[PDB]
From Swiss-Prot:
Signal peptide region: none
Residues of the full protein shown: 422 to 491 of 1054
Lineage: Eukaryota, Metazoa, Chordata, Craniata, Vertebrata
Gene name tied to this protein: DIS3L
Main function: Catalytic component of the RNA exosome complex which has 3'->5' exoribonuclease activity and participates in a multitude of cellular RNA processing and degradation events. In the cytoplasm, the RNA exosome complex is involved in general mRNA turnover and specifically degrades inherently unstable mRNAs containing AU-rich elements (AREs) within their 3' untranslated regions, and in RNA surveillance pathways, preventing translation of aberrant mRNAs. It seems to be involved in degradation of histone mRNA.
Residue runs in coiled coils: none
Residues that span the membrane, as ranges: none
Family membership noted in the UniProt record: Belongs to the RNR ribonuclease family.
Compartments (UniProt record): Cytoplasm
Name of the protein described by the UniProt record: DIS3-like exonuclease 1
Summary of subunit composition and partner proteins: Component of the RNA exosome complex. The catalytically inactive RNA exosome core (Exo-9) complex is believed to associate with catalytic subunits EXOSC10, and DIS3 or DIS3L in cytoplasmic- and nuclear-specific RNA exosome complex forms.
Length: 70
RNA sequence: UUUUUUUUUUUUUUUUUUUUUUUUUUCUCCUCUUUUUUUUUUUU
């Protein structure tokens, strides 16, 4: 009840989205997951082999932003 | 040696109809105390 009060009072929504707001999703399905279309591999410039990327991140960091490389 | 007569289960069937959830009261009402109101910053 207190958490609900804190939400309602401070103007924050707790409603999951609607069908048309859901349906517009990238399809990360097991029968066909996501993988880069090769014309965009052309158009970009890969570095997954010639350079090292890693990250320290807080405990529980289910979603990383920060990365660097020197 | 004991004849003859004294009715019985109401008659009738071939009449028209153009609405509609509910329904009808109760008054004015003293919110107690460190504050201006804090605020960059970074790790989600």
């Amino acid at each position: 009840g207190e958490i609900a009060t804190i939400l309602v009072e401070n103007s924050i929504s707790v409603i999951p989205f609607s069908e048309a707001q859901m349906c517009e999703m990238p399809v990360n399905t097991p029968e066909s997951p996501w993988k880069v279309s090769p014309e965009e591999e052309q158009k970009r410039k890969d570095l997954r082999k010639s350079h090292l990327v890693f990250s320290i991140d807080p405990k529980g960091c289910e979603d990383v932003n920060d990365t660097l490389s020197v």
